[PDB]
Amino acid sequence: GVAMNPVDHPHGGGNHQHIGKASTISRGAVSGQKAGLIAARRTGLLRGS
Amino acid sequence: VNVPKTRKTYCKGKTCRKHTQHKVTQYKAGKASLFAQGKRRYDRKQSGFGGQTKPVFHKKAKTTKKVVLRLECVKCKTRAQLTLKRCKHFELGGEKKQKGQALQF
RNA sequence: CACGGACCAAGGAGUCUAACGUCUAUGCGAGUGUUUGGGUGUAAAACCCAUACGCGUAAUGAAAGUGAACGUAGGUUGGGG
RNA sequence: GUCGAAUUUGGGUAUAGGGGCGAAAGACUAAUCGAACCAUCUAGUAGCUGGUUCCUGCCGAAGUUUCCCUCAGGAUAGCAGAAGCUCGUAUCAGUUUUAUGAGGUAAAGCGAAUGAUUAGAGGUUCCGGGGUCGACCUUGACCUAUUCUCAAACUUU
RNA sequence: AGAACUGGCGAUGCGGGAUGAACCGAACGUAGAGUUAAGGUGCCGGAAUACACGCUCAUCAGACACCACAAAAGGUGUUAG
RNA sequence: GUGAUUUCUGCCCAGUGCUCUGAAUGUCAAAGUGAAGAAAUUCAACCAAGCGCGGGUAAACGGCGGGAGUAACUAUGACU
RNA sequence: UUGACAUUGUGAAGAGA
RNA sequence: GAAGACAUUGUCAGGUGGGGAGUUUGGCUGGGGCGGCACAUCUGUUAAACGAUAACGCAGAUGUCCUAAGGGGGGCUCAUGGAGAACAGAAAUCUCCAGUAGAACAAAAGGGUAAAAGCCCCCUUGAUUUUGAUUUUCAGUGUGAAUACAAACCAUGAAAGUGUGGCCUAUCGAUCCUUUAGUCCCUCGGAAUUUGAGGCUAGAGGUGCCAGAAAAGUUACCACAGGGAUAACUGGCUUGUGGCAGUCAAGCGUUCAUAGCGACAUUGCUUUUUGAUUCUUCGAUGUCGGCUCUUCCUAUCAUACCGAAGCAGAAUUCGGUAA
Numbered sequence: 001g002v003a004m005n006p007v008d009h010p011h012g013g014g015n016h017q018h019i020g021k022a023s024t025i026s027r028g029a030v031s032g033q034k035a036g037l038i039a040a041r042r043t044g045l046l047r048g049s
Numbered sequence: 050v051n052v053p054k055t056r057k058t059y060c061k062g063k064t065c066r067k068h069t070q071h072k073v074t075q076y077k078a079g080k081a082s083l084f085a086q087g088k089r090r091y092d093r094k095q096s097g098f099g100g101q102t103k104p105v106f107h108k109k110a111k112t113t114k115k116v117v118l119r120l121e122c123v124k125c126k127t128r129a130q131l132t133l134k135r136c137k138h139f140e141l142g143g144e145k146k147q148k149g150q151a152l153q154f
Numbered sequence: 155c156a157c158g159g160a161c162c163a164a165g166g167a168g169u170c171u172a173a174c175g176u177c178u179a180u181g182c183g184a185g186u187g188u189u190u191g192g193g194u195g196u197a198a199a200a201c202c203c204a205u206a207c208g209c210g211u212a213a214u215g216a217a218a219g220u221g222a223a224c225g226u227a228g229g230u231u232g233g234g235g
Numbered sequence: 236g237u238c239g240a241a242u243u244u245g246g247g248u249a250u251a252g253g254g255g256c257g258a259a260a261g262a263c264u265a266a267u268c269g270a271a272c273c274a275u276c277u278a279g280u281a282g283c284u285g286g287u288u289c290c291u292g293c294c295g296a297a298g299u300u301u302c303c304c305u306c307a308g309g310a311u312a313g314c315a316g317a318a319g320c321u322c323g324u325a326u327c328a329g330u331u332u333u334a335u336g337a338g339g340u341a342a343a344g345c346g347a348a349u350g351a352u353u354a355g356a357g358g359u360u361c362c363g364g365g366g367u368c369g370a371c372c373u374u375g376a377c378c379u380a381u382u383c384u385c386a387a388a389c390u391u392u
Numbered sequence: 393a394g395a396a397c398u399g400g401c402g403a404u405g406c407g408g409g410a411u412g413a414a415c416c417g418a419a420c421g422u423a424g425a426g427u428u429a430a431g432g433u434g435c436c437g438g439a440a441u442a443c444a445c446g447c448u449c450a451u452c453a454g455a456c457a458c459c460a461c462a463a464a465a466g467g468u469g470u471u472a473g
Numbered sequence: 474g475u476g477a478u479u480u481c482u483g484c485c486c487a488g489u490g491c492u493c494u495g496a497a498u499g500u501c502a503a504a505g506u507g508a509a510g511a512a513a514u515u516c517a518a519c520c521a522a523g524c525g526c527g528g529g530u531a532a533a534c535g536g537c538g539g540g541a542g543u544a545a546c547u548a549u550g551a552c553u
Numbered sequence: 554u555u556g557a558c559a560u561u562g563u564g565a566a567g568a569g570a
Numbered sequence: 571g572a573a574g575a576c577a578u579u580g581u582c583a584g585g586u587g588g589g590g591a592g593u594u595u596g597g598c599u600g601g602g603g604c605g606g607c608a609c610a611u612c613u614g615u616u617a618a619a620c621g622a623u624a625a626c627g628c629a630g631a632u633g634u635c636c637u638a639a640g641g642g643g644g645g646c647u648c649a650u651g652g653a654g655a656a657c658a659g660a661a662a663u664c665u666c667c668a669g670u671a672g673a674a675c676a677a678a679a680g681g682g683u684a685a686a687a688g689c690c691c692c693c694u695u696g697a698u699u700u701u702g703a704u705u706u707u708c709a710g711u712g713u714g715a716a717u718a719c720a721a722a723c724c725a726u727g728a729a730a731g732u733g734u735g736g737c738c739u740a741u742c743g744a745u746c747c748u749u750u751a752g753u754c755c756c757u758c759g760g761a762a763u764u765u766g767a768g769g770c771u772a773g774a775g776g777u778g779c780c781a782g783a784a785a786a787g788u789u790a791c792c793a794c795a796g797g798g799a800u801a802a803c804u805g806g807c808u809u810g811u812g813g814c815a816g817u818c819a820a821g822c823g824u825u826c827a828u829a830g831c832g833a834c835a836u837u838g839c840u841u842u843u844u845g846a847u848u849c850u851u852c853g854a855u856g857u858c859g860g861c862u863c864u865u866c867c868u869a870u871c872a873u874a875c876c877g878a879a880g881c882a883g884a885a886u887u888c889g890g891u892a893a
């Protein structure tokens with residue numbers, strides 16, 4: 001999605017390739033806004049066994 | 050400005066037309082009841098769909114507001130309204146200044 | 155060294171409508187308007203007509219209201235005839 | 236460039252316009268795509284370009300005032316045409332004369348105020364401060380009459 | 393670039409400035425004759441290669457408002473003072 | 474999201490988001506109750522999520538400084 | 554998503570100013 | 571079997587909601603933008619001796635402040651300087667003389683004022699009621715501000731008088747709505763009483779883009795109507811800037827102004843620099859450099875002929891006719 005144009009995906013903002021706003025979306029988010037880490041409780045590398 | 054809490058001025062009371070003593074208060078506007086016709090016309094407009102209807106002011110350039118002095122007749126009880134010029138600070142019954150005083154402390 | 159126009163013919167752009175202002179012509183005139191309708195007919199014409207209605211004959215107040223002669227319907231100064 | 240596989244391909248079939256479809260170019264969706272094609276609302280609105288059809292006769296402008304989300308536009312007054320009407324030299328006049336006001340520009344003034352500005356001379360500080368000596372000379376500060384040159388925001392005149 | 397006053401151009405041809413929005417002269421029905429303006433009168437070109445006193449010789453002389461540029465500084469060129 | 478293999482992937486959760494069987498009365502609708510009223514109404518209390526508070530979270534979006542002291546010529550600054 | 558009202562019937566304890 | 575008056579379905583209510591829908595995102599402007607306010611105003615000057623008068627002209631100022639810094643009376647006279655007094659010194663408080671304003675009057679500036687308009691003290695609330703007229707701006711509308719009255723009712727002083735805010739020139743606000751006071755008034759139209767509401771007059775809450783919309787961005791994916799009223803090449807005026815050259819000759823050059831040079835100044839040219847401007851072209855004049863080729867300029871690098879030298883020769887340097 002970060003590779004598309006803004007029409008095709010919220011990520012699709014260009015001129016560099018970056019998401020530009022938090023990649024963690026709410027649960028109460030609306031169809032069409034939900035892309036990326038959806039209900040995400042936490043994020044990043046864990047190493048939790 | 051500093052104004053006194055009392056002044057002797059002409060009264061329009063039909064019982065006494067002459068300079069009387071007046072309790073000098075300051076104006077504050079009322080609660081603006083919901084049943085004034087405009088407000089129930091507005092709430093009509095405001096309903097349904099179509100979002101905001103009457104405008105919403107934004108561009109305000111005023112620092113102050115004009116100070117309206119209500120004067121209540123001590124005897125005949127009838128109130129009259131008087132308005133001041135613009136001021137940033139207004140106190141009624143403020144402490145009169147005094148000349149020649151040592152600059153304090 | 156700004157734009158349209160290679161040429162010819164034909165076509166090609168301030169209209170009608172409703173409500174109005176000034177002005178003018180006309181009818182009648184403190185009145186006026188036959189044509190909604192009816193009568194009538196040589197039949198969309200022409201001719202004719204009741205009741206109404208519209209505007210005018212009073213203004214002024216937001217409104218309840220009130221409602222225009224002291225005087226040859228006034229005084230002074232002009233004024234054509 | 237690739238050429239035995241994410242290979243090339245027929246036909247059948249599916250997804251349709253703020254929709255599809257996209258190994259992502261805003262690409263593709265019938266020579267049409269940063270929103271298809273068709274008809275209608277639609278003679279859409281245009282302070283913006285363009286055009287606007289016979290002849291003669293008389294008169295004859297404006298780009299200024301004020302207000303405007305006013306500055307390529309309006310309203311407004313002015314300039315202009317027409318229609319006239321009341322009267323017949325009543326009244327006037329982009330002119331002078333005489334009488335009587337008002338003005339502070341040009342010029343002028345700075346040994347007048349103000350502000351600026353060159354030069355000496357005289358006179359108190361007996362110094363503001365240091366020296367020469369167990370009070371005399373420099374420095375400045377003031378003061379007096381002079382001298383050169385200035386003013387849109389100086390000025391008697 | 394921007395004000396003041398008036399005159400103009402625009403909206404206007406005519407004669408003059410060769411040429412030309414705005415300069416000079418003059419403003420315009422159709423014509424004849426006379427006279428002029430501004431400008432001209434060697435030849436182009438209508439009009440004295442007119443009269444008069446001087447000055448000027450330039451191996452880019454100069455030649456007429458607006459107007460189509462030249463300065464300081466020099467010259468034992470020549471002229472007057 | 475990143476983009477084979479190898480190797481490594483640091484610091485920062487204050488912000489913007491995401492997330493939490495985390496303290497609260499702080500704010501907080503409509504229905505509901507209470508008070509006053511002849512009623513229309515006014516006035517209160519109580520109160521959901523949310524906000525507000527608190528916790529976590531950067532292979533979430535993203536961030537990684539300006540100053541000065543300081544070692545025997547100078548210089549630099551392992552040090553504060 | 555949250556509350557209310559209605560779909561909405563039948564019972565029991567034990568608690569709130 | 572599970573599940574159970576939960577849930578689901580329904581209707582309101584609060585929250586969330588660029589996923590989606592609309593819409594919007596000033597003006598002036600030596601192009602736009604950025605800045606700025608020349609957008610509402612005030613003083614001085616520009617302004618050309620009535621009045622008016624422009625530029626993003628020059629020096630400044632305003633969105634305030636004051637129960638007195640308003641109103642009246644009275645006494646008094648201020649800047650500043652000289653000469654004089656325990657500590658007391660430059661600076662304390664006291665005195666006399668001088669003192670046309672050289673001070674003060676909120677503030678910008680200008681004007682105005684000396685038995686005051688200043689300082690000081692005394693009393694008051696004309697910073698009030700009513701409602702018209704007049705001046706500035708002007709359309710002779712509004713608004714702001716102001717002037718002279720009338721009708722009341724007050725202050726002040728012995729009084730005559732003066733006072734309708736601040737000595738004068740600036741210090742501000744429509745309709746719609748809300749709101750408060752006033753008249754105790756009108757109306758809710760089948761008739762009444764109360765509550766509520768709607769009026770009349772007068773204030774306030776504000777529009778500073780100040781005659782008064784309710785408003786964020788991006789587009790190199792772009793679009794339309796126009797514009798040479800307008801920027802980005804040429805060309806045109808200008809020549810500050812850039813380039814080139816004069817004049818005077820203090821000085822340089824051992825000596826010696828000028829062989830060769832040249833400060834302070836000053837007169838110029840040029841348009842292969844850059845600006846300034848915005849006339850031409852926006853229904854289109856192909857935008858850098860190079861290559862190629864022609865021709866012109868001369869402010870001459872070489873070459874021909876020369877003059878000068880601080881030219882012995884050699885070299886060099888200055889110059890003339892030369893493109």
Ligand SMILES: NC[C@@H]1O[C@H](O[C@H]2[C@@H](O)[C@H](O[C@@H]3[C@@H](O)[C@H](N)C[C@H](N)[C@H]3O[C@H]3O[C@H](CO)[C@@H](O)[C@H](O)[C@H]3N)O[C@@H]2CO)[C@H](N)[C@@H](O)[C@@H]1O
Pocket residue numbers: 328331
């Ligand atoms: N020659 C005398 C001088 O000039 C004048 O005197 C007289 C005339 O020269 C002067 O004429 C002036 C004229 O200059 C200029 N146009 C101004 C003004 N409009 C004229 O004056 C006249 O104007 C019109 C009539 O024309 C009248 O309505 C007006 O009342 C009258 N004063 O009008 C003056 C009175 O009739 C000045 N008053 C004065 O300088 C002095 O007397």
Ligand SMILES: NC[C@@H]1O[C@H](O[C@H]2[C@@H](O)[C@H](O[C@@H]3[C@@H](O)[C@H](N)C[C@H](N)[C@H]3O[C@H]3O[C@H](CO)[C@@H](O)[C@H](O)[C@H]3N)O[C@@H]2CO)[C@H](N)[C@@H](O)[C@@H]1O
Pocket residue numbers: 347391
């Ligand atoms: N006023 C009458 C006229 O005065 C004229 O004379 C004028 C001048 O001569 C005279 O100037 C005198 C001067 O003469 C005398 N020697 C010195 C004196 N200070 C000057 O005085 C004048 O100038 C000074 C400024 O210099 C001003 O401050 C002063 O007010 C002014 N009057 O001032 C006079 C004007 O005030 C003529 N004599 C004549 O036309 C007639 O008499």
Ligand SMILES: NC[C@@H]1O[C@H](O[C@H]2[C@@H](O)[C@H](O[C@@H]3[C@@H](O)[C@H](N)C[C@H](N)[C@H]3O[C@H]3O[C@H](CO)[C@@H](O)[C@H](O)[C@H]3N)O[C@@H]2CO)[C@H](N)[C@@H](O)[C@@H]1O
Pocket residue numbers: 345349350
């Ligand atoms: N040159 C002397 C010194 O310079 C100044 O003073 C000089 C001037 O300022 C002063 O000039 C005169 C004066 O003589 C005379 N008596 C009084 C006059 N007002 C002064 O005027 C001076 O100032 C005014 C502006 O205020 C100027 O307009 C005027 O041109 C100027 N001369 O006199 C001095 C000589 O002309 C200093 N004030 C002072 O130290 C001392 O006098």
Ligand SMILES: NC[C@@H]1O[C@H](O[C@H]2[C@@H](O)[C@H](O[C@@H]3[C@@H](O)[C@H](N)C[C@H](N)[C@H]3O[C@H]3O[C@H](CO)[C@@H](O)[C@H](O)[C@H]3N)O[C@@H]2CO)[C@H](N)[C@@H](O)[C@@H]1O
Pocket residue numbers: none
């Ligand atoms: N080379 C061998 C000889 O030397 C000769 O000698 C010449 C050179 O040494 C020197 O000439 C110089 C030259 O060096 C330099 N590069 C150019 C400069 N313009 C010349 O200058 C000379 O010659 C020119 C033109 O002829 C003259 O106008 C000038 O007066 C003269 N000084 O000066 C001599 C001529 O005056 C020539 N170079 C050459 O022709 C001859 O055969």
Ligand SMILES: [Mg+2]
Pocket residue numbers: 003004005014
């Ligand atoms: Mg892309």
Ligand SMILES: [Mg+2]
Pocket residue numbers: 006007009010
């Ligand atoms: Mg998006």
Ligand SMILES: [Mg+2]
Pocket residue numbers: 002010011012013014018019020
């Ligand atoms: Mg992006």
Ligand SMILES: [Mg+2]
Pocket residue numbers: 014015016017
């Ligand atoms: Mg990109």
Ligand SMILES: [Mg+2]
Pocket residue numbers: 014015
């Ligand atoms: Mg890119």
Ligand SMILES: [Mg+2]
Pocket residue numbers: 017
């Ligand atoms: Mg990347």
Ligand SMILES: [Mg+2]
Pocket residue numbers: 002017018019
């Ligand atoms: Mg990335």
Ligand SMILES: [Mg+2]
Pocket residue numbers: 010021
């Ligand atoms: Mg987002």
Ligand SMILES: [Mg+2]
Pocket residue numbers: none
């Ligand atoms: Mg009485």
Ligand SMILES: [Mg+2]
Pocket residue numbers: 096
């Ligand atoms: Mg409703």
Ligand SMILES: [Mg+2]
Pocket residue numbers: 096097
């Ligand atoms: Mg609703």
Ligand SMILES: [Mg+2]
Pocket residue numbers: 130131
């Ligand atoms: Mg009042």
